Every structure is written in C-alpha cells, then in structure tokens.
Amino acid sequence: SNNLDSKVGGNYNYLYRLFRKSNLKPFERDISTEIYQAGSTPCNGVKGF
Amino acid sequence: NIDGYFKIYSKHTPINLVRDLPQGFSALEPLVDLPIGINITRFQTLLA
Ligand SMILES: *[C@@H]1O[C@H](CO)[C@@H](O[C@@H]2O[C@H](CO)[C@@H](O)[C@H](O)[C@H]2NC(C)=O)[C@H](O)[C@H]1NC(C)=O
Numbered sequence: 001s002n003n004l005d006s007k008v009g010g011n012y013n014y015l016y017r018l019f020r021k022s023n024l025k026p027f028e029r030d031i032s033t034e035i036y037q038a039g040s041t042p043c044n045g046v047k048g049f
Numbered sequence: 050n051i052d053g054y055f056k057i058y059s060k061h062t063p064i065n066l067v068r069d070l071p072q073g074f075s076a077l078e079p080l081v082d083l084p085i086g087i088n089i090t091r092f093q094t095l096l097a
Binding site for chain 2: 026027029
C-alpha cells in the first residue's frame with residue numbers, strides 16, 4: 001500500500017497494539033488505551049516506571 | 050452468542066394453567082441471528 005498510505009516524515013495515523021496481558025481470541029477487537037503493567041508493580045494514572 | 054453471532058430461538062404456545070411452568074413438551078424454532086460481535090457478560094429485560 002506504499003503509494004497511498006506512506007508519508008515522508010511518517011504517516012503516524014496508523015496504530016497497532018504492542019503491550020497487553022494476554023493474547024486475544026479469534027475475531028476479537030480490543031479498543032483499550034489503558035496503561036500496561038510491564039513490572040511486578042501495579043501501575044496507576046497516566047504513566048510510570 | 051456463538052463466536053459473535055447472537056441468535057434467538059422462540060416458541061409461543063397457548064396454555065390453561067395457574068401454577069408453575071407447564072409440565073409438558075415442545076421445541077423452539079430458530080427465529081433470528083444478528084452478527085453483533087459484542088461481548089455479553091450480562092443482561093436485563095424491559096417492562097412497559
Ligand atoms: C468480556 O467481559 C468480561 C468482563 O469484563 C471479561 O471477563 C473478565 O476478564 C478479566 C481478565 O481475565 C478478569 O479480571 C475479570 O474478573 C473478568 N470478569 C468477567 C465477569 O468475566 C471477559 O474476558 C470478556 N470477554 C472477551 C472475549 O473479551
């Protein structure tokens with residue numbers, strides 16, 4: 001899709017999910033923007049270590 | 050719901066009883082299927 005979807009600085013309008021707790025189910029769609037806990041600590045609010 | 054397809058089966062039958070769910074036999078026909086894809090954990094009815 002080069003010709004239509006590519007932009008020289010970057011067409012950053014395209015997102016993919018990168019971090020979550022488990023893998024999803026067949027034909028599931030998940031719309032979350034909630035913060036992933038990558039450490040053992042719980043995470044709360046906007047961001048954290 | 051099966052894999053996102055939400056399905057209804059039903060039966061309306063006439064009766065004459067003033068006690069619990071009529072002891073007897075019948076089958077529900079399929080009525081509709083809608084491809085809603087949603088999660089349903091829970092539900093409620095609607096009175097009037
Ligand atoms: C549909 O929603 C339910 C409830 O939100 C999901 O089940 C929850 O899953 C989390 C993570 O495993 C648990 O912490 C909750 O305790 C669960 N609650 C209930 C009532 O199930 C369920 O996984 C969702 N289904 C899909 C396919 O996303």
